[PDB]
Structure 1
Amino acid sequence: TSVGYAVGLGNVWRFPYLCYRNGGGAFMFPYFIMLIFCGIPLFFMELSFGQFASQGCLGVWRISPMFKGVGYGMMVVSTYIGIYYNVVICIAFYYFFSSMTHVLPWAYCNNPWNTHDCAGVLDHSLQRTSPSEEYWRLYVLKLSDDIGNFGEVRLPLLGCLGVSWLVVFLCLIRGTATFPYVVLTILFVRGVTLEGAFDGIMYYLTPQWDKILEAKVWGDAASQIFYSLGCAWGGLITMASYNKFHNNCYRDSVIISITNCATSVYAGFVIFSILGFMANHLGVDVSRVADHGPGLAFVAYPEALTLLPISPLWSLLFFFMLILLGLGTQFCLLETLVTAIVDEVGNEWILQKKTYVTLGVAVAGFLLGIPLTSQAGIYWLLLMDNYAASFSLVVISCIMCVAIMYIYGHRNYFQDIQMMLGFPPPLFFQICWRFVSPAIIFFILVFTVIQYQPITYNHYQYPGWAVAIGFLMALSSVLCIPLYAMFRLCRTDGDTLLQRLKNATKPSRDWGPALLEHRTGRYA
């Protein structure tokens, strides 16, 4: 049809380092399996569910009011996600402003912010370092040893974060595509004909059959397959309201998922190409050429731009594109939260004064993002990526999927699609929804708990209190489900622990098509 949009920050910065962190090519096959049997079939459901009634992340839960806690917990995940994008976005603002010189600062192994073991590509001891790494570590952030020393605050980064939180606010209060693909193609053309790039593509292929029997690989695969698509992420169910009741959500689900996966894999090729040259010209293997840190795009992409002629223009376009991409994501991600919180109160004094709540949500993010921009920035930003976005979105999505088709009913939802789409859901979709995906999610979740929780599960050797804080934050996103369930069970008429459950999970009196002339049969 046309461009499938997508191509967010979860396709240029997240996947390239997640794949390297999960051992490289051992992550691709589980990713394909989890996208085929827990991806697309977890997207058509959300599209149909939103197209049912024109609502957002909240309000749609009129099927089982006791389960409305899923919606409230869904925002909590978005809050922990829509706060650490700007820190990454702010770093992009520190590179756009830095690329204002005839020669790029991260392109010469002679600058004062280097060491004696620095290596070069243009024109001792052990563990040779590429000139790009000794810019992200010793000059941008000045990272300390660990969380043990908080350090001072990087003034340039703190200043750039203010603009990151300001431009979004100004653009929000006042009231495109095919560009990433051409830049990615230009970056792909270079760095592959260079000698040594062949080794960097093989490591992106030939998956290791020995390592596929683990838990971390599939755990990350489920998170990535749900994070990029938008399942329980916010900003996906809400826009389903702005869709015609007779729109082919099946075609959109088929096209968007494939396009997003193709873009992510293409970014994988682009990123892993430079790693081969790094390994070749440094003298180490591909698996240990870099570090398993949160920033790999800022370590691999800049060197590719250096090799290209007339590099400053390319850098200016690339980082400008990245900034616009991040702002485009954050715009919707924050606007949906503001709309939900405004509609939640349902009052008048907090209705016409929407500017104040917009300032309040924006000011809160600015203040709470201060400690991320400091001498211990990498570790704190990286802590909120393992125990904040992983193993919570998948759990919430699985619980929602079970609740829709095992309490409301499997015949009802299947019958409804006939009244929306001409042809019934395919027999593949019926089997995958009912048994396959919930069983896979349950098996992964139980296997990550029964086994594989030793000290070696700590891939990063975090201290006990820090991992305790991360575990506490992880629970908060998922622990909202039973609390609201009990809260609503209190209000229900207290007969016995059999009738209260039925009296609190039945559909409400306004569950049906959003508009009239569509409620004529069962939903009339």
Structure 2
Amino acid sequence: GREQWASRLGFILAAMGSAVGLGNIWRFSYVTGENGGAAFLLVYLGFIALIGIPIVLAEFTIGRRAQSDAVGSFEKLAPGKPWKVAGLMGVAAGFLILSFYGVIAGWILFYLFNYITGQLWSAPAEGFGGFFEGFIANPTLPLFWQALFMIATIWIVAIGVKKGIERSNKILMPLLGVLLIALAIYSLTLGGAKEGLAFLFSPDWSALKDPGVYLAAISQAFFTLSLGMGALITYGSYVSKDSRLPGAAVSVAGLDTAFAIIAGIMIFPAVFALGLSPSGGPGLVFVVLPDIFDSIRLGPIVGIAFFILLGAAALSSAVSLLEVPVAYFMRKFDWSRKQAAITLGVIITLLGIPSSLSFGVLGEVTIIPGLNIFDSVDFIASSVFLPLGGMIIALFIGWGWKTSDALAESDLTDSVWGKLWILSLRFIAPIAILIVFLSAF
């Protein structure tokens, strides 16, 4: 008696709700800002089309065919084979990513609280940078705001696939999109549009000589798509026998890429208008956007609505993160859904506390040479586990299945896209990820 998405539209909304989150605005802004902008963008865009779309389809195909969790989908489709390592790494990557994801999601609830309590309406004397720096440097407060978010994340995954994840507000993600477009229009009028549009859309190939911008591009590509973390295999697992998988893949990435491009038109024109540097770091959007909201007469209302819609999309992305280990520990250890959700949830919360302290007391502590605790947990998950875990998934469909099985389960039997899709999984994606791995390291 295994669960499945009750409604018909629930699967694509859940996958979109998984993809559209903090990686589109927070991470995309500062990863693009410190990687040169336009040149990094085109490489990132080319990775999404060539590699992101096939892997999104590939993860959908594995889960729907096997109807099991992340690891058990490889045990059923290929028993006694080492392909399951991609499922193991994905479970670990979701564990690592969720730990610091809730921390950033704690920053959002804290800013939402301030707007709701009239704090951040006008500019504090320390400035929005000093207010942000002073808040992240505080040890206790972000832990408290990380906890509240994880509780809501735990609450939803414990309720179930049908009653919780499936039952979500359809309006919030378009509301967020409507709010981003309106904010993008306003940012063009601030005076830094030309400076920002040049940084964002005029390629400077000088920054392309470093092979690290490809690694950072493939990292943001897989992060924003929820790939390599067992999410889409799991959301594909609860899918009925008849459903259109290819169009879901293009809708997920197409909508997601639309949400990321608009986030660049809002941030970078606003960055240059304030005279800031695009390579500030993780707190780029937390120091820029409050500056921009304060320029608005009704900015407090804009800020309240902004951190509500963004917080809900971050809520749906973390729910898709927590669902992967819960699904594994349910089948493996016979844990109840509530027990697995609370246990893993509190565990991942404690694992994310070291990432939160790296912005304050633990700033000078590094694990990977030159990278603090937060940058090292992110780098291992995003830049190492996600591509390497995604390469094996591609090789799994390209060389572990017979072609008729892949095209049939992917519904690409009678189309030209099946030929280009198999080409990408067998050669394009695994070789390109390999070349990026060899070049960066």
User: TM-score of the superposition, structure 1-length normalised?
Assistant: 0.71
**Structure 2 CA distance, aligned partners of 1:389 and 1:338?**
21
Structure 1: any 5+ residue segments left out of the alignment? 115-130, 143-152, 280-285, 450-524
Residue pair 1:11, 1:228 contacting (<8 A) in 2 also: yes
Task: State the match for 2:180 in structure 1.
Answer: 184
Q: Does 1:324 align with 2:312?
A: yes
Residue pair 1:106, 1:132 contacting (<8 A) in 2 also: no
Change in Cα spacing, 1:416 to 1:214, as seen in structure 2 (3 Å) is same
Q: Does 1:264 align with 2:280?
A: no
Which of 331, 340, 343 is the equivalent residue of 2:331? 343
**Structure 2 CA distance, aligned partners of 1:412 and 1:357?**
37
**Structure 2 CA distance, aligned partners of 1:315 and 1:181?**
15
Q: Does 1:155 align with 2:152?
A: no
Task: State the match for 2:213 in structure 1.
Answer: 217
Structure 2: any 5+ residue segments left out of the alignment? 1-8, 161-168, 364-371
The one-letter amino acid of 1:60's match is S
**Pairwise CA distance, 1:345:** 2.4
Sequence identity (%): 24
**Structure 2 CA distance, aligned partners of 1:48 and 1:361?**
27
Which of 115, 118, 125 is the equivalent residue of 1:99? 115
Change in Cα spacing, 1:434 to 1:161, as seen in structure 2 (3 Å) is closer
**Pairwise CA distance, 1:242:** 2.8
Change in Cα spacing, 1:60 to 1:314, as seen in structure 2 (3 Å) is same
Residue pair 2:153, 2:322 contacting (<8 A) in 1 also: no
**Pairwise CA distance, 1:267:** 0.7
Which of 31, 44, 47 is the equivalent residue of 1:18? 31
Matched position secondary structure for 2:205: coil
Task: State the match for 1:393 in structure 2.
Answer: 386
Superimposed CA distance per residue, residues 264-296 of structure 1 (whole angstroms, 9 cap, x where no aligned partner): 1111111112012012xxxxxx7xx25442221
Residue pair 1:405, 1:413 contacting (<8 A) in 2 also: no
Q: Which structure would you say has the larger Rg?
A: 1
**Pairwise CA distance, 1:414:** 4.7
Superimposed CA distance per residue, residues 207-252 of structure 1 (whole angstroms, 9 cap, x where no aligned partner): 1123323311111111121122122222211121232323221222
Matched position secondary structure for 1:294: coil
Q: Does 1:361 align with 2:349?
A: no
**Structure 1 CA distance, aligned partners of 2:252 and 2:375?**
29
**Pairwise CA distance, 1:335:** 2.8
Change in Cα spacing, 1:157 to 1:33, as seen in structure 2 (3 Å) is closer
Task: State the match for 1:40 in structure 2.
Answer: 53
RMSD of equivalent CA atoms: 2.6
**Structure 2 CA distance, aligned partners of 1:415 and 1:155?**
52
Task: State the match for 2:397 in structure 1.
Answer: 404
Superimposed CA distance per residue, residues 72-108 of structure 1 (whole angstroms, 9 cap, x where no aligned partner): 2221111001111111111112212212455736625
Residue pair 1:106, 1:135 contacting (<8 A) in 2 also: no
**Structure 2 CA distance, aligned partners of 1:250 and 1:171?**
28
Matched position secondary structure for 1:369: helix
Superimposed CA distance per residue, residues 48-71 of structure 1 (whole angstroms, 9 cap, x where no aligned partner): 233323222122213152312332
Change in Cα spacing, 1:106 to 1:252, as seen in structure 2 (3 Å) is same
Which of 83, 92, 105 is the equivalent residue of 1:89? 105
Superimposed CA distance per residue, residues 146-184 of structure 1 (whole angstroms, 9 cap, x where no aligned partner): xxxxxxx63333333332233333444445331101211
Task: State the match for 1:438 in structure 2.
Answer: 430
**Structure 1 CA distance, aligned partners of 2:210 and 2:251?**
31
Change in Cα spacing, 1:377 to 1:262, as seen in structure 2 (3 Å) is farther
Higher helix share: 2
**Structure 1 CA distance, aligned partners of 2:174 and 2:24?**
15
**Structure 2 CA distance, aligned partners of 1:323 and 1:419?**
35
Which of 353, 372, 396 is the equivalent residue of 1:370? 353
**Pairwise CA distance, 1:25:** 1.7
Aligned length: 404
Please show how residues 47-86 of structure 1 align to structure 2 within 5 Å: 47-61=60-74, 62=76, 63-67=78-82, 68-86=84-102
Change in Cα spacing, 1:363 to 1:392, as seen in structure 2 (3 Å) is closer
Which of 201, 221, 235 is the equivalent residue of 1:239? 235
Q: Does 1:447 align with 2:439?
A: yes
